[PDB]
């Protein structure tokens, strides 16, 4: 089997991408944030505290003839940005782009943090990291991809995120028309539960490539590119007037600037992020100070190849017995 679904930016900045997902019988379609940095499929629901729902579409398990309460199961998750959610668990039929999993754990939120309530466009998350990170207790549950894997034509999914435009998540096949050149594959460590890999270096604009190992995670659920402070400083030094602002929370730059590209290495291959992809717009409405799309990871503990980096590539998440990642230009 295969599946293919369009993923759409939630706003004009590409802050996140939503993909429609069918849950239950009859189907209830929710728009979920596919997140290769986590491993829970959780949704706003009829059980979510009413004051914490503000415009999201909810899953109502009582209206699904295939929903079953997973007795005794609870979940609770905290994300790298400080947001969180928790609740109980159903199993139900879940379909993405024509690919159907029966008995998928659907984690129903009883509580969500304010950032989720305040974003009416995201109805939940669909985790695509390794199932070892799943938070369901006392019996950990498998991700959608883990449940589908054995049925897929090939045990892979691909992320093709658009810049200011829709893109595609495919399951079970590699669309050879969706990229240019070849796909370069690189080793993955699953020891932390992430799609963790080592970039071979970087360049700023037309500058020389610096060969240096940068360990990080491929994370579709993170907006920006978070890299070591040395790398980030070298990038922003090429933008007149750019500076790190402690009050804003990162590097800002004059909105009148033209940003240089940023290149990262994948083996001997190179993925070029155009400068425009690094502009996240005014820090507040009407400001002439703009927020940068490349930021320091120093306060995270890991480097994160988020959407800024991934949307410059066609990315293969190869879930073979020994997982690997693939990157192609497009």
UniProtKB/Swiss-Prot annotation:
It comes from the Eukaryota. Its EC number is 3.4.23.22. Coiled coil: none annotated. Keywords: Aspartyl protease, Disulfide bond, Hydrolase, Protease, Signal, Zymogen. The active site is at 35, 199. One of its GO terms (molecular function) is aspartic-type endopeptidase activity. Residues 17-328 form the Peptidase A1 domain. Disulfide bonds join 255-290. It is an enzyme of class 3 (hydrolase). GO terms for biological process: proteolysis. The keyword Disulfide bond applies. It catalyses: Hydrolysis of proteins with specificity similar to that of pepsin A, prefers hydrophobic residues at P1 and P1', but does not cleave 14-Ala-|-Leu-15 in the B chain of insulin or Z-Glu-Tyr. Clots milk. The keyword Cell cycle does not apply. Belongs to the peptidase A1 family. This is Endothiapepsin.
